[PDB]
């Protein structure tokens with residue numbers, strides 16, 4: 001029931017009304033399960049971002065739990081920091097860090113990134129994924145929209161609306177959740193899957209950074225959704241533009257066998273991630289000056 005769900009939420013969220021100390025709401029997106037705004041904290045003049053998700057308009061209402069239960073003040077240098085969570089009226093509100101460089105989607109649709117910057121983004125994603133897999137969490141929707149930047153080129157991971165916990169005891173999942181063009185091959189076929197789905201999506205995101213779109217991004221969602229199931233790993237339309245180091249690194253990502261996919265903890269020792277430029281390398285890719 002709606003009311004039982006609201007009651008359960010009120011036991012984990014911070015009480016009261018955040019509209020007391022927030023104003024100048026500026027809308028910035030409609031991402032995953034809710035709209036995302038920016039507000040100023042009048043008590044300080046600082047800026048924060050606010051994810052508003054209405055319980056009434058949800059496919060699965062049970063998705064709202066995880067990001068306030070799993071990502072409850074979990075700190076990490078490469079993961080968007082959540083400050084507070086409130087239940088306002090009929091919507092759940094998440095207040096967090098304001099990442100000012102936009103999403104990575106804006107860069108891959110407008111410019112071409114050199115291997116030195118691809119390695120930077122990947123180093124950050126794997127750094128955060130390593131810890132997230134050790135603690136038992138799967139992102140389950142890693143893609144361009146899930147990656148935010150600061151003004152200084154630092155990269156953080158976001159959009160945990162689809163994440164899940166595995167930990168000990170039961171260690172797998174079988175839920176068909178995410179974005180169609182970015183998911184694993186043992187996804188569309190319901191099979192017990194662990195953190196490795198993320199890694200696969202990461203590989204597809206690598207493809208993004210090389211071409212500006214996931215394999216079969218031109219086909220409608222189901223038209224490609226089924227299309228990847230039988231096929232072998234896709235390959236980039238611009239493979240001639242990528243060095244063999246990137247190609248090897250990516251060849252240990254888009255492995256069809258989940259038991260022969262690489263693990264983020266073991267992917268950090270790879271050679272390609274020596275090409276990782278300082279975060280400043282990413283800075284010229286943002287809209288300040290392309």
Ligand SMILES: Nc1nccc(-n2cc(C(=O)N3CCC[C@@H](N)C3)c3ccc(C#CC4(O)CCCCC4)cc32)n1
Pocket residue numbers: 028029030031032035036049051067071079080081082094096097098099100101102103105145146148157158159160161
């Ligand atoms: N600059 C800035 N800063 C902070 C947030 C933010 N942001 C914009 C979103 C948005 O709508 N986008 C993304 C861009 C492309 C567009 N198509 C759609 C968006 C969606 C979800 C979350 C999330 C979350 C958490 O799970 C992360 C861990 C802690 C709990 C909350 C954040 C989002 N953007």
